């Protein structure tokens, strides 16, 4: 079977700049009928892939004229002119010349933007969760850049590291920032034995952390 390769797993780019995603097949995809059977797809988090280019260089209907594919018989290049935050995602190349059809490994387009500090919000357990005996404290660290961030939880002044679940979003398609959610889950019995709950975010943008807290007795 044909092996499709995309040397780069990711490629950065400045918004409004042009970029190119290269791909190669182990065999020529140029069929005698004159058609080069190669496809390009963009896949966004939680969405089925979507064709961008078909038959090596045909722009897909509904697809902006910013995207276009070129390339020899085994070396292909997808170019995006004046990239937009909306373009982040993973781009794949596919050959459908011979069975079985095969995909490249994907190249993740990453937008490079200006650094931004996170907006931190902390939320105590809802009355509904408490009725059920659980007590989750949630902290959202939103719209920051670059991706790396650290969160630290404190309860009545002491750092707490167990019972914490963290999750990050993929890059934002509207503003190219990242966001992270951190949840500290206690039982209601324990939650009711402490007063102070604190979320601390330490990000590149500053050596001083952004701290948000509440007092169960406030």
């Amino acid at each position: 079977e044909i092996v499709m390769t995309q040397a780069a797993p990711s490629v950065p780019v400045t918004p409004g700049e042009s970029v190119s995603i290269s791909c190669r097949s182990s065999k020529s995809l140029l069929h005698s009928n004159g058609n080069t059977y190669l496809n390009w797809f963009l896949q966004r988090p939680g969405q089925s892939p979507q064709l961008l280019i078909y038959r090596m260089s045909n722009l897909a209907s509904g697809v902006p004229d910013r995207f276009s594919g070129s390339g020899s018989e085994t070396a292909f290049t997808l170019r995006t002119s004046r990239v937009e935050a909306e373009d982040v995602g993973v781009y794949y190349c596919m050959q459908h010349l011979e069975y079985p059809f095969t995909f490249g490994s994907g190249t993740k387009l990453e937008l490079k933007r200006a650094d931004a500090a996170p907006t931190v919000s902390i939320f105590p357990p809802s009355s509904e969760q408490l009725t059920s005996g659980g007590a989750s404290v949630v902290c959202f660290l939103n719209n920051f850049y670059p991706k790396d961030i650290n969160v630290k939880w404190k309860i009545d002044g002491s750092e707490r590291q167990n019972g914490v679940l963290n999750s990050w979003t993929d890059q934002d398609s509207k503003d190219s920032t990242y966001s992270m959610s951190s949840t500290l889950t206690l039982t209601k019995d324990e939650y009711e034995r402490h007063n102070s709950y604190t979320c601390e975010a330490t990000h590149k943008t500053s050596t001083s952390p952004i701290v948000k807290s509440f007092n169960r007795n406030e």
Partner: protein
């Protein structure tokens, strides 16, 4: 159109419904072409790797394509899309022995903009679909990938809007859990 989820037990089999190609994709991974079937003459074509795994048997009466997976392993847990180049919605197959559990859905209210959230806790299997005001609010929304903890998933979503418009202009978090055919529409209210 294909179902959102299927929790098949290890070893069991599953019949998934939809030139009808089929693509496999393990969450967080790439895609693999499984094989193209043809309802016209029930002309099924398999990928060697799956030839022994799936069977693209169509149906003229239902006018729907199908693909069956026999004796599944956690290696079979994945998203299965059935494309025509019409991509289906895909079904998330979760090969696990655990049982279905509907999520608890809690409103996250505080205490020039304000941030509210929704915590979706204790469900299995994935996925869950979350929107705000039935999709009307999309601009300042962040939805965080679920994290598996003690055989149960937890997910959260935040939405940020102009502070003067909440609670004056209602905000409700909508969560659908396909596996359990349940949906919850939780209004965020001031504490």
């Amino acid at each position: 159109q294909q179902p959102g989820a299927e929790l098949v037990k290890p070893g069991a089999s599953v019949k998934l419904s939809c030139w009808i190609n089929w693509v496999k994709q393990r969450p967080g991974q790439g895609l693999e072409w499984i094989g193209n079937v043809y309802p016209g003459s029930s002309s099924t074509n398999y990928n060697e790797k799956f030839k022994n795994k799936a069977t693209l048997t169509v149906d003229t009466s239902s006018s729907t394509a199908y693909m069956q997976l026999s004796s599944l392993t956690s290696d079979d847990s994945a998203f299965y899309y059935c494309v025509r180049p019409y991509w289906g919605q895909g079904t998330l197959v979760t090969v696990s022995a655990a049982k279905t559990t509907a999520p608890s859905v809690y409103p996250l209210a505080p205490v020039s903009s304000v941030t509210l959230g929704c915590l979706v806790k204790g469900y299995f299997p994935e996925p869950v679909t979350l929107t705000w005001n039935s999709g009307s609010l999309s601009s300042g929304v962040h939805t965080f990938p679920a994290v598996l903890q003690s055989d149960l998933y937890t997910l959260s979503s935040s939405v940020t809007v102009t502070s003067s418009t909440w609670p004056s202009q209602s905000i409700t978090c909508n969560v659908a859990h396909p596996a359990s055919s349940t949906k919850v529409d939780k209004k965020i209210e001031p504490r």
